[PDB]
């Protein structure tokens, strides 16, 4: 049976890129942060970069601190660096164009952040856009057959394909509509030759008022189904803390359950803490 957590990844020694997608209000932004936070506590001798193309600068909202276009360390830690940028601004109705040039610009712009700096980023985490991931560009050269571009794409595609180098973490909630989408996602991701072996399921009540001990039902219902249907994935099951959750402390505090599988019976007292 596949361990129900993200320990394997949070302790990787091959992963240079970790995308993190999922459409919907899925607590994903808290998920990207937890992962980034956790890796950086488990490999201090490594430099992690967490970026967002989300143009509402969520990474900032989340940390409650104001990032920007130039990689900057999180106040509270010395290997984790948020970056919030926008490719469109910085940046032929073919399918793939926009996406390529865009992402492309991102990378160019990440390396700028590394050269002019001096110190450099080990493993970078992508917190996919609220308007979906730009990963369609992976299949550009195919529908292709100017080459200055198709040439760059390949160089990356090669590197996003290597399952030791790069994987995608899916985020979701225990709900028909969400899951449906999550599977649809996994299909596309594989359409690309992109490793994906992890699924984070957020917001579960574990309810042991009367809307809770009813909403729980469907959650538990579809949970059973996820179980039958992704045996070969680690799928970490995550608690729902009341109200918003943001702040390097809190963030750190809750990020643990991507490491050691949250168990309501026992890990319970830690959820009241974050609910105050």
């Amino acid at each position: 049976t596949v361990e129900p957590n993200l320990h394997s990844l949070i302790t990787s020694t091959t992963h240079k890129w970790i995308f993190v997608g999922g459409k919907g209000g899925v607590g994903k932004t808290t998920s990207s942060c937890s992962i980034a936070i956790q890796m950086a506590l488990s490999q201090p001798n490594k430099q992690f970069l967490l970026i967002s193309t989300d143009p509402a600068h969520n990474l900032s909202d989340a940390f409650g601190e104001k990032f920007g276009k130039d990689a900057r360390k999180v106040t509270g830690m010395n290997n984790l660096s948020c970056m919030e940028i926008d490719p469109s601004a910085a940046l032929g109705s073919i399918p793939g164009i926009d996406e390529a040039l865009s992402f492309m610009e991102v990378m160019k712009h990440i390396k700028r952040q590394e050269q002019g700096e001096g110190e450099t980023f080990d493993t970078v985490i992508f917190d996919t856009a609220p308007t979906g991931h730009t990963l369609r560009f992976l299949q550009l050269p195919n529908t292709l057959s100017l080459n200055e571009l198709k040439a760059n794409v390949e160089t990356i595609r090669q590197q996003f394909t290597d399952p030791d180098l790069t994987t995608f973490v899916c985020v979701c909630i225990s709900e028909f509509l969400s899951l449906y989408e999550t599977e649809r996602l996994i299909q596309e991701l594989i359409s690309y030759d992109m490793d994906v072996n992890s699924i984070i399921v957020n917001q579960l009540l574990f309810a042991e008022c009367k809307r809770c001990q009813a909403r729980w039902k469907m959650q538990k219902k579809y949970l059973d189904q996820i179980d039958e249907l992704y045996e070969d994935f680690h799928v970490v099951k995550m608690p729902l803390c009341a109200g918003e959750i943001r702040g390097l402390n809190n963030l750190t505090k809750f990020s643990q359950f991507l490491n050691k599988e949250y168990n309501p019976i026992t890990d319970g007292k830690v959820i009241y803490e974050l609910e105050d």
Binding site: F176, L179, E183, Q187, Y222, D224, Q225, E228, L229
Partner: protein, 54 residues
């Protein structure tokens, strides 16, 4: 060979109608595997079709 091709489409067509008649919402696991399989057959077919194209 076309005799294998035909053999498949029955499967696809039959499995579609079956999945069509199930509560995808009350039998999520089942509905999906069936959909996956459904997609699987779509691709095995064209590999066939294209051979026959010669």
């Amino acid at each position: 060979l076309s005799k294998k091709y035909l053999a498949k489409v029955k499967e696809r067509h039959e499995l579609k109608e079956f999945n069509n008649s199930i509560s995808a919402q009350d039998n999520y696991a089942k509905w999906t595997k069936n959909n996956r399989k459904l997609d699987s057959l779509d691709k095995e077919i064209n590999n066939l079709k294209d051979e026959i194209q010669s």
